[PDB]
Amino acid sequence: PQITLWKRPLVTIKIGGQLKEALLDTGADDTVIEEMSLPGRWKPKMIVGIGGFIKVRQYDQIIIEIAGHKAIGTVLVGPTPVNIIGRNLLTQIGATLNF
Amino acid sequence: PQITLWKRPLVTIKIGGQLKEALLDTGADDTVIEEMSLPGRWKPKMIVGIGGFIKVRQYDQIIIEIAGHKAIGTVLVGPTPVNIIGRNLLTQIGATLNF
Ligand SMILES: CC(C)CN(C[C@@H](O)[C@H](Cc1ccccc1)NC(=O)O[C@H]1CO[C@H]2OCC[C@H]21)S(=O)(=O)c1ccc(N)cc1
Ligand SMILES: [Cl-]
Numbered sequence: 001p002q003i004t005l006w007k008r009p010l011v012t013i014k015i016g017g018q019l020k021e022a023l024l025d026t027g028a029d030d031t032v033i034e035e036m037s038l039p040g041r042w043k044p045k046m047i048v049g050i051g052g053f054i055k056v057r058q059y060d061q062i063i064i065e066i067a068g069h070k071a072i073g074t075v076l077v078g079p080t081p082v083n084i085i086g087r088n089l090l091t092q093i094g095a096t097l098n099f
Numbered sequence: 100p101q102i103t104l105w106k107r108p109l110v111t112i113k114i115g116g117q118l119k120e121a122l123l124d125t126g127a128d129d130t131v132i133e134e135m136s137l138p139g140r141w142k143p144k145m146i147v148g149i150g151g152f153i154k155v156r157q158y159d160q161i162i163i164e165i166a167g168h169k170a171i172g173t174v175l176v177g178p179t180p181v182n183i184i185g186r187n188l189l190t191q192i193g194a195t196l197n198f
């Protein structure tokens with residue numbers, strides 16, 4: 001697809017057996033999802049945005065289907081106001097910014 | 100250009116005749132830059148992101164060049180952790196997300 005930016009670039013994702021809406025976000029280094037359970041080990045991390053930092057749990061080697069495209073990588077879980085697909089997974093589906 | 104996302108999509112911007120670096124950010128509705136002087140009157144705005152909110156100065160109809168493309172539009176100025184180019188200006192430079 002070609003996604004224009006007149007509106008927020010929201011897509012459906014599937015993660016840990018759940019369907020979620022998420023933002024395709026070139027400004028996010030890594031993917032961050034609202035509180036949910038995921039399998040396996042995790043470790044804590046802080047990430048920063050507008051407003052400051054939040055504490056998240058870092059889960060590695062998690063598979064997400066993004067707009068029907070499967071990717072695997074690190075997923076951060078924590079109190080984000082919006083689900084965000086970051087560059088670590090956008091690369092994997094071949095996403096580019098074009099102008 | 101076609102910009103891949105293996106690295107942060109940083110570009111040079113020109114604003115008030117000065118060059119700065121900024122992040123192309125599809126997850127941002129609005130363009131937000133670090134403290135700087137801009138001409139004219141400003142209006143209040145609060146923006147909300149991952150770690151809570153910040154107050155910013157909203158300047159309208161500001162001439163800005165992004166990666167060599169001319170734009171004229173709203174720039175928010177305040178204590179953002181990084182300079183971000185949001186959809187308001189990404190649309191002016193004809194940017195799309197493609198995968
Ligand atoms: C500020 C960026 C450098 C980083 N952020 C991504 C950014 O796209 C967020 C993503 C975002 C979006 C909504 C709410 C929180 C986070 N947008 C954002 O804060 O935009 C603000 C400016 O325009 C307004 O429109 C959206 C909120 C305002 S972030 O969400 O803080 C973040 C930081 C690190 C990671 N790994 C993942 C996400
Ligand atoms: Cl992958």
Ligand SMILES: [Cl-]
Binds near residue numbers: 073074088
């Ligand atoms: Cl990863």
Ligand SMILES: [Cl-]
Binds near residue numbers: 103
């Ligand atoms: Cl590539």
Ligand SMILES: [Cl-]
Binds near residue numbers: 095096102
């Ligand atoms: Cl990419």
Ligand SMILES: [Cl-]
Binds near residue numbers: 171172173187188
């Ligand atoms: Cl604008």
